[PDB]
Design an enzyme around this catalytic site. Structure first.
Site, PDB file in Angstrom:
ATOM      1  N   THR A   1       0.826  -1.200   0.000  1.00  0.00           N
ATOM      2  CA  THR A   1       0.000   0.000   0.000  1.00  0.00           C
ATOM      3  C   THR A   1       0.865   1.255   0.000  1.00  0.00           C
ATOM      4  O   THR A   1       1.770   1.393   0.818  1.00  0.00           O
ATOM      5  CB  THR A   1      -0.947   0.034   1.217  1.00  0.00           C
ATOM      6  OG1 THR A   1      -1.934  -0.996   1.084  1.00  0.00           O
ATOM      7  CG2 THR A   1      -1.643   1.383   1.324  1.00  0.00           C
ATOM      8  N   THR A   2       0.590   2.160  -0.937  1.00  0.00           N
ATOM      9  CA  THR A   2       1.261   3.452  -1.004  1.00  0.00           C
ATOM     10  C   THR A   2       0.204   4.544  -0.997  1.00  0.00           C
ATOM     11  O   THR A   2      -0.636   4.600  -1.901  1.00  0.00           O
ATOM     12  CB  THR A   2       2.131   3.567  -2.259  1.00  0.00           C
ATOM     13  OG1 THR A   2       3.202   2.617  -2.191  1.00  0.00           O
ATOM     14  CG2 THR A   2       2.706   4.967  -2.375  1.00  0.00           C
ATOM     15  N   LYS A  33      -8.447   3.446  -2.045  1.00  0.00           N
ATOM     16  CA  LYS A  33      -8.005   3.773  -0.699  1.00  0.00           C
ATOM     17  C   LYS A  33      -8.222   5.235  -0.339  1.00  0.00           C
ATOM     18  O   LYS A  33      -7.901   5.636   0.783  1.00  0.00           O
ATOM     19  CB  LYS A  33      -6.527   3.405  -0.532  1.00  0.00           C
ATOM     20  CG  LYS A  33      -6.238   1.943  -0.819  1.00  0.00           C
ATOM     21  CD  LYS A  33      -4.760   1.691  -1.053  1.00  0.00           C
ATOM     22  CE  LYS A  33      -4.514   0.242  -1.442  1.00  0.00           C
ATOM     23  NZ  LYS A  33      -3.067  -0.094  -1.471  1.00  0.00           N
ATOM     24  N   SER A 130       3.338   0.590   3.215  1.00  0.00           N
ATOM     25  CA  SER A 130       4.602  -0.119   3.053  1.00  0.00           C
ATOM     26  C   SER A 130       5.491   0.546   2.010  1.00  0.00           C
ATOM     27  O   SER A 130       6.718   0.549   2.152  1.00  0.00           O
ATOM     28  CB  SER A 130       4.340  -1.577   2.677  1.00  0.00           C
ATOM     29  OG  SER A 130       3.564  -1.664   1.495  1.00  0.00           O
ATOM     30  N   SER A 170       2.610  -2.972  -3.292  1.00  0.00           N
ATOM     31  CA  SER A 170       1.925  -1.877  -3.956  1.00  0.00           C
ATOM     32  C   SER A 170       1.980  -2.081  -5.464  1.00  0.00           C
ATOM     33  O   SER A 170       2.891  -2.724  -5.992  1.00  0.00           O
ATOM     34  CB  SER A 170       2.549  -0.526  -3.583  1.00  0.00           C
ATOM     35  OG  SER A 170       2.501  -0.306  -2.186  1.00  0.00           O
TER      36      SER A 170
END
Lengths: 229, 230
Positions: A1-2, A33, A130, A170
């Protein structure tokens, strides 16, 4: 996830990847997101999907009633305080990193970071997930504060692309939303049109010389790609 | 007396007689010649057969040690096979520990050190063969000779065996600076055919190998239809 959020003069730009992964398998490759709280306030969620979804839904419900009660708009600081309280009371049971970014007529564009610990920091830009670990030195070198709206959107997309080019957790689509005094505008750019990836990078085109042909010399002459040669 | 029964004994004049006897055994073996042609190395040996029913290629005396290195044996063939096995072990150690082909001089020094160790202990006897090392490594074409005494010497042209002096004299007529492997193969084969006595060794064959640029610097045997008939 970015996830990330960057403030410009008018408002804020929120950028995120689209990948929900169960460790090493991609459960979802078109996630969203960037979660709406109010019309002009959004949150970037990282960590546990269920926990972040429940937190965002509860905060949005709280804020929607508050607008009706006061009969006016909500500042970004109020939403940041709501997330900070709700994440601090549940810090031992949830895994959530939140970025609260938005526009209010009083304070303009605001960006707040609420890490897993439960603190709340007001920043010009915030990174999370992350893949954020790859972006810090990217912001120290390439980010100049005071960019225009389009420049900020382009920089956010480029940063997200650079982040998931190196992060296995990601990837996928890049989703951006711009929040300012005008109508908020969203954008989703696909991977095949991404501003950066190592597959199209000319400096990673030449393969590492690992499969030496059997030779009578110590001279390195490329990889062996043929049985005869 | 007892001064020549083992290698661990010096003679009154400082000689090791067992090594000399091994060299004498080498000197009674079939003739071999070798030439370094500034672009590669060509080695040619004569094989004497005691039977006319031998399959072609029997008793090979030239063996590849590495891709670019090979050894010809002049003398006791099984001892040469042991030396070839040691040289192959030395060559693959370089390719596995140091990730580089073994240099010709380094391989020759290893072969000489291995052969010398058998001339110093009472429990072993010296090898009864001389080793001709032909290499084309990063140090260019190299031609070395290892003596049963364990001493190694580099040559432009060298001859060993029973018909050694005449073969050496024929080799003295070459230039070795304008000489190329293509004509050197024929030259060595012609020298071996001329120097060999036809009334004592009825069954004889000429076995020629080389490693130059034409084989991609790989030590191989010649094409069959390249050596002269006689």
């Amino acid at each position: 996830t970015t996830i990330l959020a960057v403030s410009y003069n008018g408002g804020v730009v929120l950028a995120a990847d689209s990948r929900t992964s169960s460790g090493t398998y991609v459960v979802n490759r078109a996630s969203n997101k960037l979660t709406k709280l109010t019309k002009k306030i959004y949150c970037c969620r990282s960590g546990s999907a269920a926990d972040t979804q429940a937190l965002a839904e509860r905060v949005s419900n709280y804020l929607g009633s508050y607008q009706t009660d006061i009969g006016a708009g909500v500042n970004v600081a109020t939403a940041a305080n709501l997330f900070q309280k709700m994440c601090y009371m549940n810090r031992w049971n949830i895994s959530a990193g939140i970025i609260v970014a938005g526009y209010d007529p009083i304070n303009g564009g605001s960006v707040y970071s609420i890490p897993s610990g439960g603190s709340c920091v007001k920043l010009d830009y915030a990174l999370g997930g992350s893949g954020s670990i790859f972006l810090y030195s990217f912001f120290d070198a390439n980010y100049k504060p005071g960019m225009s709206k389009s420049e900020c959107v382009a920089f956010c997309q480029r940063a997200v692309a650079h982040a998931y080019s190196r992060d296995g957790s990601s990837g996928g689509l890049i989703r951006t939303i711009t929040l300012d005094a005008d109508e908020p505008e969203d954008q989703t750019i696909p991977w095949n049109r991404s501003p950066y990836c190592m597959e199209k990078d000319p400096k990673y085109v030449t393969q590492a010389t690992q499969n030496q042909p059997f030779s009578s010399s110590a001279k390195i002459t490329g990889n062996r790609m043929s049985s005869t040669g | 007396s007892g001064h020549d029964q083992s290698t661990d004994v010096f003679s009154a004049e400082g000689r090791v007689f067992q090594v000399e006897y091994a060299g004498k055994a080498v000197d009674n073996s079939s003739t071999a010649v070798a030439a370094c042609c500034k672009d590669g190395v060509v080695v040619a040996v004569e094989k004497v057969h005691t039977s006319r029913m031998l399959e072609k290629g029997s008793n090979n005396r030239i063996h590849a040690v590495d891709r670019q290195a090979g050894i010809c044996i002049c003398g006791l063939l099984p001892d040469g096979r042991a030396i070839v096995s040691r040289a192959r072990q030395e060559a693959e150690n370089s390719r596995d520990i140091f990730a580089t082909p073994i240099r010709g001089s380094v391989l020759a020094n290893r072969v000489g050190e291995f052969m010398h160790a058998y001339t110093t202990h009472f429990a072993y006897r010296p090898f009864g063969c001389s080793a001709i090392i032909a290499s084309y490594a990063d140090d260019g074409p190299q031609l070395f000779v290892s003596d049963p005494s364990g001493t190694v010497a580099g040559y432009y042209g060298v001859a060993l065996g029973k018909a050694k002096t005449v073969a050496k004299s024929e080799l003295e007529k070459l230039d070795f600076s304008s000489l190329t492997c293509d004509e050197a193969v024929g030259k060595l084969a012609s020298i071996l055919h001329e120097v060999h006595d036809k009334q004592k060794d009825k069954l004889y064959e000429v076995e020629v190998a080389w490693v130059c640029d034409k084989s991609d610097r790989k030590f191989v045997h010649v094409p069959a239809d390249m050596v002269p008939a006689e």
